[PDB]
Amino acid sequence: MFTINAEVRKEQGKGASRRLRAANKFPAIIYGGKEAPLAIELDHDKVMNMQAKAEFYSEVLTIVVDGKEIKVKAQDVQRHPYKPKLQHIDFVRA
C-alpha cells in the first residue's frame, strides 16, 4: 500500500523550493547511479501520515511519476528543526 503519487519539479533553487513547502509540497530526489538524478515533488500530508510506520524506512516503495512505476527505497531524510514536518527525502533508486 506504499504507493506515492508525485510529480516532476521544474523550478529548482532555494526560492522555488521554499515557495513549494509553503503550499504543502516538499521536494525530494531520486538517484540510483544508473540513470539521471530525478527531481521529484511529493505531497506533504500523505507522506507525513505514512512515515509513522516502520515499513516506510525499509521496504521497497513504489513512487509513481508520469505513469512510471519506479521501485525505490528511502535512504536519507532531512526533517524540519522543530515543527513536525519534512523538508527533503533522499530516495535511493534500487
Partner 1 sequence: MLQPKRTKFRKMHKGRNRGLAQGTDVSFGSFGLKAVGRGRLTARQIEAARRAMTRAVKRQGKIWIRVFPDKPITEKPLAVRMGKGKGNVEYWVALIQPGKVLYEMDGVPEELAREAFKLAAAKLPIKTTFVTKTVM
Partner RNA sequence: GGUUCUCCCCGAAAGCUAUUUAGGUAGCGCCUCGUGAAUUCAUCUCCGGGGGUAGAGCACUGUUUCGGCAAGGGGGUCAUCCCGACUUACCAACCCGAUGCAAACUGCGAAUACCGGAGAAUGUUAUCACGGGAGACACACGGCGGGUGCUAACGUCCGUCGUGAAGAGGGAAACAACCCAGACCGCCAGCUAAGGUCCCAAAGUCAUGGUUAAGUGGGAAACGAUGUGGGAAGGCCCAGACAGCCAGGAUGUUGGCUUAGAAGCAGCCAUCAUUUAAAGAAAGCGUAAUAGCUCACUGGUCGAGUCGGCCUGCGCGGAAGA
Partner RNA sequence: UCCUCCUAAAGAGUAACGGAGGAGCACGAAGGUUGGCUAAUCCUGGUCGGACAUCAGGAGGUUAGUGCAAUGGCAUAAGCC
Partner RNA sequence: GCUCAACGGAUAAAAGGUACUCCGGGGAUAACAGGCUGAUACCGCCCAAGAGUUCAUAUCGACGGCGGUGUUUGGCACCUCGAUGUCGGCUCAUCACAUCCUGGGGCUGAAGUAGGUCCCAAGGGUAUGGCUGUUCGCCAUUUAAAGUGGUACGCGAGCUG
Partner RNA sequence: UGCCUGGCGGCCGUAGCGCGGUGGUCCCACCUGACCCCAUGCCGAACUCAGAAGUGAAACGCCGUAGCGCCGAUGGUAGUGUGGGGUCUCCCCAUGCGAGAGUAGGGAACUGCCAGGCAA
Contacts of 25 (CB under 8 A, 6+ apart): 41, 42, 43, 44
Q: Which is nearer to RNA, 37 or 55 (CB)?
A: 37
- Closest to partner 1 by CB, 14 vs 68, is 14
Strand blocks (E) in the chain: 3-8, 25-31, 38-43, 61-65, 68-79, 86-93
The yes or no reply on residue 88 touching RNA (CB under 7 A) is yes
Among 6, 27, 42, 74, binds RNA (CB under 7 A): 27
> Is 67 a residue that touches RNA (CB under 7 A)?
no
